Design a binder for this molecule. Structure first.
Ligand SMILES: CCCCCCCCCCCCCCCCCC(=O)OC[C@H](COP(=O)([O-])OCC(O)COP(=O)([O-])OC[C@@H](COC(=O)CCCCCCCCCCCCCCCCC)OC(=O)CCCCCCCCCCCCCCCCC)OC(=O)CCCCCCCCCCCCCCCCC
Ligand SMILES: CCCCCCCCCCCCCCCCCC(=O)OC[C@H](COP(=O)([O-])OCC(O)COP(=O)([O-])OC[C@@H](COC(=O)CCCCCCCCCCCCCCCCC)OC(=O)CCCCCCCCCCCCCCCCC)OC(=O)CCCCCCCCCCCCCCCCC
Ligand SMILES: CCCCCCCCCCCCCCCCCC(=O)OC[C@H](COP(=O)([O-])OCC(O)COP(=O)([O-])OC[C@@H](COC(=O)CCCCCCCCCCCCCCCCC)OC(=O)CCCCCCCCCCCCCCCCC)OC(=O)CCCCCCCCCCCCCCCCC
Ligand code: HEA
Ligand SMILES: CCCCCCCCCCCCCCCCCC(=O)OC[C@H](COP(=O)(O)OC[C@H](N)C(=O)O)OC(=O)CCCCCCCCCCCCCCCCC
Ligand SMILES: CCCCCCCCCCCCCCCCCC(=O)OC[C@H](COP(=O)([O-])OCC[N+](C)(C)C)OC(=O)CCCCCCCCCCCCCCCCC
Ligand SMILES: CCCCCCCCCCCCCCCCCC(=O)OC[C@H](COP(=O)([O-])OCC[N+](C)(C)C)OC(=O)CCCCCCCCCCCCCCCCC
Ligand SMILES: CCCCCCCCCCCCCCCCCC(=O)OC[C@H](COP(=O)([O-])OCC[N+](C)(C)C)OC(=O)CCCCCCCCCCCCCCCCC
Ligand SMILES: CCCCCCCCCCCCCCCCCC(=O)OC[C@H](COP(=O)([O-])OCC[N+](C)(C)C)OC(=O)CCCCCCCCCCCCCCCCC
Lengths: 318, 171, 243, 211, 346, 97
């Protein structure tokens, strides 16, 4: 199968930067309210967990969406953190893609049909995602607290009007720039797990479906659905703990639970919520992951196929 | 007709149709005794409709092929049998859809989790008119209990008659 | 879907709620009729107020609207057999559709013959009337209906006659014309049907006309002044000329 | 015996995150006793039949069509297993518990329904199994379930696929006459360059490339 | 390369099989533009006729509420003339024609286009029947799910447009026409105003689409022996098949509108919580588990059947006419359909 | 204090502040008007009062005026009868064919 890779045309650094930034901006704009609901769901069960039984386990994304819309802000009230989430997402993607492209070009195989194994690519992507998540941890922290201050009492709300405003408020109130990286390790772990739990399963199911069904058109989308499911399963506990560490106020009095780190957050989640507490908001997170991946892959495939056709690759090479 | 799809259709209408339909009837008759919960009427009806008709659609063309001289145990045959063979395969896939509906009805019944109430209400036989009276009284009470939360005939007729509320010009 | 505000929908909701709350099952009534004579009930606490033999006096076979269809059937049969119009196979098959539906009006007429009232009794208490009819196959049906369900119809049956002040009875008490009466809810054979039209033929005999009229007009009859007759002159499934 | 303390997180009235099953409005299986000994259905009147006496009340008429709405009575919810308690009730002590049946009827083993997701497999058993017998096992062979593609021009050899020759067989004199007979359908492909391109009306996919 | 997931494209060597004409082979005429055009045409025509019929029926109902129903054919003709002369009737015709354009361009046309895009390549059998019709079940389910919420904004826009004409002019939005209301609502009340608690509409659309398309295709293929073996008209057969599919779709779609009626029209019990908590979804679940099916089929023809059944029937007929149900049928023994021609005549 | 789940604590309250009406000030005003004027303000769709050739409807019409005998019926307790004697009479022809 290592003979079957198709890397005749590889985009330049400028091409990958521009395409990634544009398409990921489109995807984040399309699928941000889903992440808003997911963060909202993970906070209303910060110390309660799942208390319903059987088919009612979890928090209803439609119920959360209806409540947030009944707040009064309408659909426009789902982008408060998107003001700051977009910058953090784009910076994470820029750093990750730069590191990934450099490490890949310094290690990629000579033959166009030979590509690095999934394990090597996972190592590269995990390093890139960890570095980018550590560098974008302040932006992700500002974004989460903006969403978090809707389901919390008036005394517990930080009141961030943007990204630079949040950065300045954190650097002033909480001690300094060192306080900007609260939950940085949690974000690093979330990015590392997310960067290794998608390509593997996606290629797995895509190739197995092709073996079973040949060169149909639904193969890649079914594999994308499968990859989104498994990536959500692998990443959601880390994302949940990252949200808990981000929403933890500096004042211990203004916290439903007080965490001294990732380990403390996990311990308290297991103690009060249980094992099932890590997968609250699973439907919202999985739908967001699938829609984001579908939009990005579809638009990138269209643009890159057009570029390959312009460059002159044969139709079997595209 | 020996060693022919006429014989195949004979013993499949006897076994695949009749015997399996009786087995399904016994499963439904003892559904509470087997699983402890009431079964799902909707998916059960779907399974009944698709499984029973599928047998006809799958094994009447086999009768037609048996009358046409189609020997058994051949994977290739004269091309004057392809139409009824296709119809038989269609009937088989209808039967498969019925089986899918049966598994779906088991799944939905175990979703439902409702205690089953016998239709006899404890009086399987009306050997006496007093037994008939007791059953009638209990049946009327049970039906009244079921029909709670459902508006009366007048209210339902009012809602149905005045359902349409989309008019252009008023007074 | 409820977030869309419609004032007609709100009026419908208010009407349903007000009917649910204000209007109750127990409804007060002031339409009470006191007969001027002692009522002689039978063994079963009932008084026979109307008797007839409708099927005996009903045209069953040679009724005009249906003999036309049943005589037109052979025309279609012959048209299919010889194909005089040089039609196609599907066209002649369509020609044969008719003989399968021409007897349906006769079936409906025969069913309507079973709603002509053969006997009507008033029970003690003057609130329930028993009605005995029979399907033409000889299937006897007995139904009890509250007296307030009755609404007399006009002679032409085209409009609701006034519930009171209506004169469908002659001076001596017999029916002036074949009287149609609509029942809002008739529980026939164990199933309730809405707006059922029953008929009392003029050829029948109306015993105790007063009570009969009070049954038709919807009044509750006062049966305080009553006596009981000890006469078991009827057997179960007794034979009658109405067959 | 006994039970644990009170936790408002487990209380649907206090914890609004607990979604309510409206089909379990009046049924609380966690309070069920085995064997069931609680009466939950008795005589009900004043719904359509008044509980008072108006049989001979000439001033009162009964109109059941005006049935006032009441709280809907849901079908009885089946009991849900109390795992630990059940695992403590049917538990066996080896070589220290006598092999006997107790006198109390509460020793009866009652069937209480459990989780539902397991039956999800039972919901998809006719599908998955069939896939397992056709897709996972690739029965009968690999190429049956794949989307059909014709072989390319003269592949794998001109013996199995004499497409070029067939082209000539349709362009020669005799072949043309055969088409005029109407017993041979027209040519279904064209040889363009070293490739074979099927016509749109042929009804087949295009041959795959020799990658 | 671009984000967390890499859509790895792998080259594969050639494969082929004996037969070519009974799997998925995309039709040439099944392009995006062609499918959209044909589906939109059929949908707009069917919707226009359906909405005209609905307006006529409802205006006849109104005139019946105001005047006695006819007693004979001449009175019926006079009643129809008076209904036609109604200003309310003509305004309803115009507004429901605009709504018909909107719903046949973006809902019925979208359903037809998605169904064609998903079910065009399923080829039939040459001289038999498409035995593997199960392959079209997940495909038709996806087609129905994708186009299920397309009619929701237009349905809610119609409800809001007719929902303000019944208020005093001090509380009215204006809405000179349904198109104006559709253009104004998402900017005044918000886009979610057109997508709130629309589960009954979504599930009704899903059931209509799936039942109608699947049943019509299945009966058009399987019952073809009626006009291939039996020498019937095939057009009476097509009409009967379309009617059966439409009746099944209406039967399987009405209970969700019944759920809406139960939730927001059934009188409440004072001092008690709502039976379904005002969600409609549990209501469907309740109807899914209700013992007395007829208890949620009352008003089937009065409320819903005569407002969607003609539309579905005409959609089926026009889609068949324009060729959205035509499937490729090629002989498997001759030429393109086979890769082993030796074993076809010996 | 908190983390003692014997009694509910406002620290675990999960409710979003109602900043503005969900669907606008006009929607709120119409909701209030409904809350106050439900059942009193009853619009009537426009129909001409006098129309030539039509007999005005002043009372309910008898069942003898129907152009179609309906099949289903209603039991007064709110039940819906699909199976009626009319249904039996209507099923007599079809089953015969
Ligand atoms: C899992 C699920 C498994 C089961 C799935 C299948 C379930 C089927 C039934 C489900 C619902 C039943 C309950 C129900 O609806 O109750 C409400 C309904 C009335 O409720 P409502 O709205 O309150 O009352 C409205 C009126 O006020 C009063 O109305 P009503 O009470 O008199 O009822 C009216 C009813 C009365 O019907 C009958 O009485 C028929 C009875 C037949 C015999 C039934 C018993 C024997 C059955 C034998 C077979 C068993 C299998 O009329 C019809 O049903 C119409 C029949 C023909 C419709 C064809 C429509 C096709 C599309 C047309 C599009 C046109 C577009 C324009 C272009 C035209 C061409 C140019 O009650 C009934 O219908 C009661 C009678 C039920 C009869 C049996 C049910 C099946 C009948 C099928 C007939 C049509 C077949 C297809 C014909 C195609 C022709 C092309
Ligand atoms: C020239 C000769 C003209 C003859 C008819 C003249 C006439 O007065 O027609 C109105 C006449 C009035 O009916 P009615 O028996 O006096 O009123 C019965 C209820 O009191 C009031 O009706 P309902 O509450 O029982 O509900 C009636 C409703 C529900 O009833 C049905 O759907 C009946 C289904 C079974 C029909 C027979 C099979 O029917 C409709 O809404 C039909 C509207 C669509 C008609 C066809 C449009 C094109 C397709 O017929 C209709 O309105 C249509 C009846 C069904 C025709 C199919
Ligand atoms: C292709 C070929 C297939 C062949 C299959 C096998 C055929 C033979 C076996 C019998 C089965 C026949 C086929 C099934 C019939 C239909 C099922 C049925 O029961 O319907 C009535 C059933 C209503 O029954 P119910 O709920 O008990 O009624 C309570 C009501 O309050 C209303 O209460 P009610 O008291 O007013 O009425 C009760 C209701 C109850 O309904 C029934 O009983 C249905 C009866 C159907 C015909 C049965 C024929 C039996 C065999 C005859 C030949 C024997 C030989 O009765 C009727 O509606 C009229 C029934 C008239 C006949 C009654 C007696 C029949 C048996 C006895 C006579 C025959 C044997 C005589 C002796 C022979 C000696 C040799 O359902 C409906 O009307 C609507 C269906 C539900 C729709 C809900 C929404 C569904 C949404 C979609 C779900 C699925 C999603 C995925 C879809 C994917 C695909 C698109
Ligand atoms: C009882 C036995 C039985 C059953 C049920 C069937 C069911 C079916 N049979 Fe067969 N058949 C035989 C017994 C049976 N058969 C025998 C003995 C032979 C001869 C062998 C020989 O020729 O040498 C034969 C041969 C035979 C042939 C011969 C092939 C050939 O000779 O050319 C064909 C092909 O058409 C055929 C078709 C079918 C089909 C399409 C079904 C369909 O009905 C299949 C439908 C599926 C089911 C009926 C399974 C039900 C599903 C469940 C999961 C039930 C389990 C659930 C519970 C009830 C708890 N069968
Ligand atoms: C196959 C792979 C497993 C897929 C799902 C496994 C669990 C199914 C659903 C589930 O969550 O069960 C529930 C339990 C574990 O959850 P929990 O956190 O203890 O929930 C109780 C919580 N404390 C509360 O507040 O209510 O689950 C259990 O009871 C034990 C889980 C074992 C499943 C497989 C093991 C082999
Ligand atoms: C920061 C650096 C983080 C590195 C994390 C480990 C490597 C990347 C994740 C593993 C991976 O990509 O596995 C795909 C590989 C893919 O294997 P492969 O590359 O041989 O390809 C298999 C597919 N064929 C042969 C058909 C082409 O799968 C596994 O390793 C299977 C076991 C599951 C993963 C185990 C490690 C998980 C990560 C642990 C982190 C601690
Ligand atoms: C591993 C822990 C046990 C399995 C997951 C338990 C859990 O939280 O389930 C509820 C959660 C619920 O997710 P949710 O938070 O989206 O809840 C929505 C659920 N409804 C709307 C139906 C109420 O389910 C999952 O997480 C399903 C995927 C599990 C993947 C791992 C196995
Ligand atoms: C290890 C754990 C278990 C792993 C299990 C993995 C498999 C799981 C089960 C399958 C999941 C669903 C996959 C559907 C993909 C369909 C894609 C497609 O276009 O397929 C075209 C195929 C073939 O279509 P066709 O009929 O055009 O092709 C026939 C072959 N040629 C090309 C030569 C003419 O159709 C299907 O696969 C239909 C699937 C319908 C849904 C049922 C899924 C299981 C199917 C099993 C085989 C078929 C049985 C049919 C009756 C079943 C009754 C129960
Ligand atoms: C699947 C959709 C099928 C649609 C088929 C029909 C298409 C044609 C008709 C479309 C009508 C609706 C769009 C109107 C667009 C023009 C109006 C407009 O945009 O106004 C500015 C609107 C105005 O919003 P607003 O809410 O401020 O409205 C103002 C009115 N108040 C404040 C009183 C409510 O601005 C926005 O919408 C800003 C956000 C951009 C769009 C975000 C889309 C999110 C989509 C859902 C994502 C997932 C959410 C979670 C789901 C559950 C959990 C998983």
């Amino acid at each position: 199968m290592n003979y079957s890779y198709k890397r005749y045309w590889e985009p330049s650094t400028a091409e990958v930067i521009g395409l990634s930034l544009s398409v990921n901006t489109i995807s984040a704009a399309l699928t941000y309210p889903i992440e808003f609901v997911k963060v909202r769901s993970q906070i209303r069960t910060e110390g309660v967990g799942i208390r319903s039984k059987n088919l009612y386990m979890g928090i209803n994304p439609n119920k959360v969406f209806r409540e947030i819309h009944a707040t009064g802000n309408g659909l426009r009230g789902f982008y408060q953190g998107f003001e700051s989430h977009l910058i953090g997402r784009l910076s994470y993607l820029f750093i990750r893609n730069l590191t990934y492209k450099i490490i890949y070009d310094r290690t990629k195989p000579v033959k166009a049909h030979n590509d690095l194994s999934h394990r090597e690519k996972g190592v590269i992507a995990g390093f890139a995602g960890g570095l980018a998540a550590f560098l974008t941890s302040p932006a992700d922290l500002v974004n989460t607290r903006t969403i978090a201050e809707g389901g919390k009492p008036k005394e517990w709300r930080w009141g961030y009007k943007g990204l630079m405003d949040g950065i300045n408020k954190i650097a002033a109130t909480e001690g300094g720039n060192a306080a900007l990286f609260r939950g940085s390790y949690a974000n690093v772990l979330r990015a590392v797990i997310l960067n290794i739990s998608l390509t593997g399963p996606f290629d797995y199911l895509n190739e197995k479906i092709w073996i079973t069904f040949g060169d149909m058109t639904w193969n890649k989308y079914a594999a994308l659905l499968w990859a989104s499911f498994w990536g959500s399963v692998a990443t959601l506990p880390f994302d949940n703990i990252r949200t808990r560490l981000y929403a933890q106020n500096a004042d211990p009095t203004k916290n439903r639970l007080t965490y001294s780190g990732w380990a403390d957050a996990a311990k308290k989640l297991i103690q009060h919520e249980g094992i099932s507490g890590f997968y609250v908001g699973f439907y919202a997170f999985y739908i967001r992951t699938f829609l984001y991946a579908w939009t990005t892959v579809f638009i990138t495939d269209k643009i890159t196929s057009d570029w390959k056709r312009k460059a002159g690759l044969k139709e079997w090479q595209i | 007709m020996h060693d022919t799809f006429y014989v195949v259709a004979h013993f499949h209408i006897m076994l695949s149709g009749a015997a399996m339909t009786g087995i399904f009837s016994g499963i439904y008759y003892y559904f509470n005794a087997l699983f402890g919960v009431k079964y799902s009427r909707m998916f059960g009806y779907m399974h009944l409709i698709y499984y029973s008709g599928g047998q006809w659609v799958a094994f009447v063309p086999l009768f037609y092929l048996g009358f046409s001289g189609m020997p058994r145990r051949i994977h290739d045959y004269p091309v004057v049998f392809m139409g009824w063979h296709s119809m038989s395969t269609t009937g088989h896939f209808i039967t498969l859809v019925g089986i899918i509906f049966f598994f779906l009805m088991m799944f939905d019944s175990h979703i439902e989790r409702r205690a089953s109430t016998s239709t006899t209400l404890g009086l399987p036989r009306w050997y006496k008119r007093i037994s008939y009276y007791i059953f009638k009284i209990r049946y009327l009470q049970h039906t009244k209990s079921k029909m709670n939360g459902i508006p009366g005939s007048t209210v339902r007729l009012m809602l149905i008659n005045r359902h349409f509320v989309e008019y252009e010009v008023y007074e | 879907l409820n977030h869309v505000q419609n004032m007609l929908e709100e009026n419908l909701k208010y009407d349903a709620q007000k009917y649910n709350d204000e209007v109750a099952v127990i409804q007060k009534t002031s339409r009470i009729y006191k007969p001027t004579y002692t009522i002689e009930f039978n063994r079963e606490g009932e008084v026979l107020v109307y008797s007839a033999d409708p099927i005996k006096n009903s045209v069953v076979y040679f009724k005009y609207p249906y003999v036309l269809y049943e005589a037109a059937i052979p025309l279609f049969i012959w048209a299919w057999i010889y194909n005089p119009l040089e039609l196609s196979k599907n066209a002649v098959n369509s020609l044969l559709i008719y003989p399968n539906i021409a007897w349906i009006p006769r079936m409906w007429y025969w069913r309507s013959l079973q709603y002509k009232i053969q006997k009507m009794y008033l029970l003690r208490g003057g609130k329930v009337a028993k009605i005995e009819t029979q399907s033409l196959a000889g299937d006897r049906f007995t139904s009890w209906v509250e007296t307030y369900q009755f609404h007399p119809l006009t002679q032409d049956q085209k409009n609701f006659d006034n519930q009171d002040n209506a004169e469908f009875l002659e001076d001596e008490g017999q029916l002036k014309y074949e009287l149609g009466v609509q029942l809002d809810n008739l529980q026939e054979m164990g199933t309730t049907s809405q707006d059922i039209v029953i008929n009392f033929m003029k050829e029948g005999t109306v015993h105790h006309p007063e009570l009969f009229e009070a049954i038709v007009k919807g009044y509750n009859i006062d049966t305080s002044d009553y006596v009981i007759n000890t006469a078991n002159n009827l057997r179960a499934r007794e034979g009658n000329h109405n067959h | 015996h006994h039970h644990h303390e009170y936790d408002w997180r487990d209380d649907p009235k206090v914890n609004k995150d607990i979604e309510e099953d409206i089909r379990d409005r009046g049924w609380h299986p966690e309070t069920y006793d085995f064997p069931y000994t609680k009466k939950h259905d008795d005589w009900v009147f004043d719904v359509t039949m008044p509980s008072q006496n108006y049989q001979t009340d000439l001033t009162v008429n009964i109109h059941p069509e005006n049935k006032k709405m009441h709280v809907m009575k849901q079908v009885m919810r089946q009991s849900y297993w109390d795992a630990e308690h059940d695992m403590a009730h049917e538990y066996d002590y080896e070589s220290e518990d006598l092999d006997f049946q107790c006198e109390s009827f509460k020793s009866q083993h009652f069937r209480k329904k459990g989780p539902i997701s397991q039956y999800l497999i039972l919901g998809l058993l006719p599908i998955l199994y069939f896939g397992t017998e056709f897709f996972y096992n690739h029965y009968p062979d690999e190429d049956y379930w794949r989307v059909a593609h014709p072989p390319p021009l003269d592949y794998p050899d001109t013996d199995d696929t004499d497409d070029t020759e067939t082209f000539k067989d349709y362009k020669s004199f005799t072949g043309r006459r055969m088409v005029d007979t109407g017993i041979v359908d027209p040519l279904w492909y064209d040889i363009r360059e070293g490739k074979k391109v099927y016509y749109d009306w042929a009804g087949v996919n295009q041959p795959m490339e020799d990658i | 390369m671009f984000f967390e997931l890499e859509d790895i494209k792998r080259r594969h060597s050639l494969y082929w099989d004996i037969y070519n004409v009974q799997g998925w082979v995309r039709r040439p005429d099944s392009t995006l533009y062609n499918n959209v055009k044909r589906g939109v045409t059929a949908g707009v025509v069917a919707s226009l006729v359906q909405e005209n019929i609905t307006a006529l029926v409802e205006n006849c109902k109104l005139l019946a509420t105001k005047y006695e129903k006819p007693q004979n054919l001449r009175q019926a003709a006079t009643f129809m003339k008076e209904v036609f002369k109604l200003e309310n009737y003509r305004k309803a015709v115009w507004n429901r024609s605009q709504y018909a354009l909107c719903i046949g361009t973006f809902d019925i046309g979208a359903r037809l286009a998605t169904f064609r895009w998903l079910n065009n390549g399923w080829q039939r059998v040459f001289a038999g029947f498409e035995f593997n019709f199960v392959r079209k079940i997940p495909t038709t389910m996806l087609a129905a799910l994708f186009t299920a919420p397309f009619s929701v904004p237009f349905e809610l826009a119609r409800m809001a447009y007719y929902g303000d004409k019944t208020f005093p002019k001090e509380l009215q939005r204006g809405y000179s026409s349904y198109l104006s209301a559709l253009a104004r609502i998402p900017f005044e009340e918000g886009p979610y105003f057109l997508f709130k608690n629309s589960f009954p509409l979504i599930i009704r659309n899903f059931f209509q689409t799936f039942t109608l398309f699947y049943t019509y295709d299945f009966l058009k293929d399987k019952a073809s022996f009626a006009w291939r073996v039996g020498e019937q008209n095939e057009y009476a057969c097509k009409m009967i098949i379309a009617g059966i599919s439409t009746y099944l779709a209406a039967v399987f779609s009405y209970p969700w509108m019944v759920t809406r009626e139960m939730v927001d029209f059934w009188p409440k019990v004072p001092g008690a919580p709502c039976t379904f908590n005002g969600n409609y979804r549990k209501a469907a679940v309740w109807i899914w588990y209700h013992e007395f099916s007829g208890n949620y089929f009352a008003g089937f023809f009065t409320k819903y059947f005569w407002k969607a059944s003609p539309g579905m029937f005409l959609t089926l007929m026009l889609a068949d006419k324009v060729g959205l149900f035509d499937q490729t049928t090629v002989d498997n023994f001759g030429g393109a359909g086979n890769n082993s021609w030796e074993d076809t005549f010996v | 204090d908190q983390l003692d789940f014997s009694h509910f604590d406002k620290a675990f309250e999960n409710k979003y502040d109602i900043v503005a009406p969900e669907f606008g000030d006009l929607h709120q005003k119409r909701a209030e008007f409904i809350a106050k004027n439900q059942g009193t303000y009853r619009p009537v769709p426009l129909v001409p009062n006098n129309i030539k050739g039509l007999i005005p409807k002043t009372c309910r019409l008898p069942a003898t005026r129907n152009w179609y005998r309906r099949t289903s019926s209603f039991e007064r307790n709110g039940f819906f009868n699909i199976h009626t004697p009319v249904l039996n009479t209507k099923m007599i022809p079809w089953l015969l064919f």
